[PDB]
Amino acid sequence: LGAENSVAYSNNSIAIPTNFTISVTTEILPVSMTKTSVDCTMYICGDSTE
Amino acid sequence: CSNLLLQYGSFCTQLNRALTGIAVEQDKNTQEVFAQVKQIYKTPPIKDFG
Amino acid sequence: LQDVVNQNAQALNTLVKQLSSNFGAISSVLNDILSRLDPPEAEVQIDRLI
Numbered sequence: 001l002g003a004e005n006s007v008a009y010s011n012n013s014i015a016i017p018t019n020f021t022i023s024v025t026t027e028i029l030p031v032s033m034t035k036t037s038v039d040c041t042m043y044i045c046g047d048s049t050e
Numbered sequence: 051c052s053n054l055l056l057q058y059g060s061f062c063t064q065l066n067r068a069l070t071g072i073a074v075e076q077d078k079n080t081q082e083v084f085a086q087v088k089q090i091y092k093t094p095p096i097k098d099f100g
Numbered sequence: 101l102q103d104v105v106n107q108n109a110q111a112l113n114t115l116v117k118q119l120s121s122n123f124g125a126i127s128s129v130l131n132d133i134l135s136r137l138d139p140p141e142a143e144v145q146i147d148r149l150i
């Protein structure tokens with residue numbers, strides 16, 4: 001599940017950061033798929049009148 | 051029956067692939083909704099809690 | 101992003117490959133059926149393929 005960690009809870013202490021870091025992360029989102037079309041009669045019968 | 055199914059394209063493969071994709075995506079849902087922090091914290095002995 | 105394109109392409113390839121399937125008929129090419137069997141009893145085969 002991950003490395004174990006514990007934090008020393010106590011009602012008269014506070015832990016505050018003193019330095020920061022500007023990170024940058026990438027998120028990837030699909031938008032649209034390939035606009036496909038299909039010919040019914042051609043695909044089902046080719047070039048036959050029957 | 052196994053021979054006679056062979057004349058129907060790849061219906062079985064399509065169905066199996068769809069169901070496998072389903073099975074993958076549920077566990078993906080679980081991992082996404084639950085596992086959001088990678089530091090398993092340890093419960094402190096409850097004494098004060100204000 | 102690659103998954104969407106891959107899935108669409110694979111689906112289309114499966115759809116195209118489905119044409120090479122006799123579906124229990126004498127042949128998988130309708131032109132062969134037309135050139136081999138006269139209309140009075142070729143309609144059964146045509147209907148199966150359709």
Ligand SMILES: *[C@@H]1O[C@H](CO)[C@@H](O)[C@H](O)[C@H]1NC(C)=O
Binds near residue numbers: 098
């Ligand atoms: C919580 O604060 C009270 C102050 O009244 C103190 O007596 C108690 O020891 C504190 N709890 C700790 C330090 O765990």
Ligand SMILES: *[C@@H]1O[C@H](CO)[C@@H](O)[C@H](O)[C@H]1NC(C)=O
Binds near residue numbers: 018019020
């Ligand atoms: C804060 O972090 C930057 C990043 O390297 C460092 O240059 C700077 O000295 C740090 N300030 C501290 C630790 O007070």
